[PDB]
Design a protein around this ligand. Sequence first.
Ligand code: NDP
Ligand code: NDP
Ligand code: NA
Ligand code: NA
Lengths: 290, 290
Amino acid sequence: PAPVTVVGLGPMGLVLAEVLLAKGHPTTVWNRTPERASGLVAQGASLAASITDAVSASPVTIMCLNNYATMYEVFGPAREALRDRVLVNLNSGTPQEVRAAVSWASDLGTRYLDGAIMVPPPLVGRPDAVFLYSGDRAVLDEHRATLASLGDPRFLGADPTLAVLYNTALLHMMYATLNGYLQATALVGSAGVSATEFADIALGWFAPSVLAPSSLAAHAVDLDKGNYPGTLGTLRMNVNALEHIARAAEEQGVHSELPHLMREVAERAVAQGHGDHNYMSVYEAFKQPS
Amino acid sequence: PAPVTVVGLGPMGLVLAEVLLAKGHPTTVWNRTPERASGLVAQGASLAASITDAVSASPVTIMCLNNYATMYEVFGPAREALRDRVLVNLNSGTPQEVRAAVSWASDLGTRYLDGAIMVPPPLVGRPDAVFLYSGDRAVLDEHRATLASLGDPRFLGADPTLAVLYNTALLHMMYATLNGYLQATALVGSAGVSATEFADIALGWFAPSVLAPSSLAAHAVDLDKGNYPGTLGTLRMNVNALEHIARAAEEQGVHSELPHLMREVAERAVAQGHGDHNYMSVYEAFKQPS
Ligand SMILES: NC(=O)C1=CN([C@@H]2O[C@H](COP(=O)(O)OP(=O)(O)OC[C@H]3O[C@@H](n4cnc5c(N)ncnc54)[C@H](OP(=O)(O)O)[C@@H]3O)[C@@H](O)[C@H]2O)C=CC1
Ligand SMILES: NC(=O)C1=CN([C@@H]2O[C@H](COP(=O)(O)OP(=O)(O)OC[C@H]3O[C@@H](n4cnc5c(N)ncnc54)[C@H](OP(=O)(O)O)[C@@H]3O)[C@@H](O)[C@H]2O)C=CC1
Ligand code: NA
Ligand code: NA
């Protein structure tokens, strides 16, 4: 197991280092506040005296800092140490932040690979914990054994922004679906229906029959074509149901802003000529900036 | 097939009457604007001269009006005629509207059964189109043959508010989940990723592994207890992800209001001491009025 450097000992960075150490890697760590490395040092990690020392200690530096902006401040003194070394950026963020980092890394002559972690810190190190990677495939192939110690590395393609972008898109789907479930549970709960009683109907019947992933996936080809046949249900009729949902949430005394905004966004699609189309035409409203 | 009355000839009421007619029921219809019955009359329906005549024409009256307030205005002159007759209320609405309707119906001496339609008008009449019912089960048992002509009648319980409440809750889950999928597709599409490439990843891997209905159902018992252990991931960490999602949508030029509001609502539960708890603790924010 090759030597590795971890820069950033927040909750995520601490677990990345702990796992690399447990998997046998000689691990050098660096953090602005050195006391965060106390437990790691007891486990066999080496606390670097400086960012340059940390970068020079290993062929690979894995960074996990609060934001992309922090990277420039932290790695400033280690710019020459980064030359001909590997920098794996596991920070979450946006495509604009990744493009700037890729340009900075190219100017320094460092081999850069951007990634995104799909799990919270306690799930890192498990064989099913997905880490997305995108950019220079050669970095992943050469340092595969090290990255595989953290979980399941999945390379998405040459575009370096893919990992962070897919992280935000997939996580958005998760939060929207969980919020839908929580809002519905709070709505029936306002009338004395228990969460478990509601799960019998909602998750036992409704969600498997109406919201099966393969059913949502069948709409994908039509989303790419902008084809939204409403022969079996139109957006205008869906708007009427959204109006009832929002008024119910409000009258029942549970959260009503998200229901009102969903009604408003569907109305925008109606205003732009999608009244006859199926509900998926609201994709046209999701494509437009707010 | 027994005689039936349909009151309300909007897009849904027109199809309820058309299906009852096709299934052989002698069908009497009434609407404030009588010209809506033109096609139904050509199909063999009888246009009632008045609301009293409509109610008196059949043992069962099925109503499908825009709102519950309309019911009092429409059925006012037929109040005495409604005594000892059956009124099936298929309007969508809220629990407060249903409780008031149940009280009004009890005072009139009419047998009342509230319901909710889970499909759009073109799917009515099919054996799998679900119609929810709640309240007096004896009404459903006695008039099951007529209601079964419209689709699959599903009785939820004695509480008359259940059908409308479940309609709004389940539909909210469907819209939230579809919107999550569309927002995510628009976000990756801003970087040149096609809807089909993304759907294969998000729905082929992510949704079955993270959002399986049985996994959401396992949270239900803890939602009822208010138990949200954050040992495997905290709400504060999920809020950091929600911030990147909103910033990504904004920078990418796609819809960002829904992502910003979801971040805001999760922050409200953090402000109330749920920062260290798991994501499902945002249920406490969904229970709060806006
Ligand atoms: N936690 C999670 O669930 C997940 C996190 N991520 C991502 O991992 C990254 C790290 O997250 P996490 O560990 O949770 O905690 P944070 O996002 O809060 O990052 C904390 C780290 O940033 C350092 N830091 C902050 N400000 C500065 C500064 N001005 N100068 C130097 N160092 C600074 C901290 O140092 P110090 O200790 O000295 O304050 C610490 O090492 C983030 O990009 C996050 O989005 C990805 C997936 C899941
Ligand atoms: N359409 C759908 O996809 C679904 C609809 N529903 C529910 O079915 C019900 C009917 O819906 P829908 O058919 O789509 O259309 P609407 O909700 O717009 O209701 C139209 C009906 O209401 C009548 N009406 C409106 N205002 C008055 C008034 N002041 N006095 C008398 N009658 C009035 C109309 O009469 P007039 O023609 O004279 O204007 C017409 O018969 C609603 O509760 C809806 O939520 C349920 C599931 C799906
Ligand atoms: Na990254
Ligand atoms: Na009803």
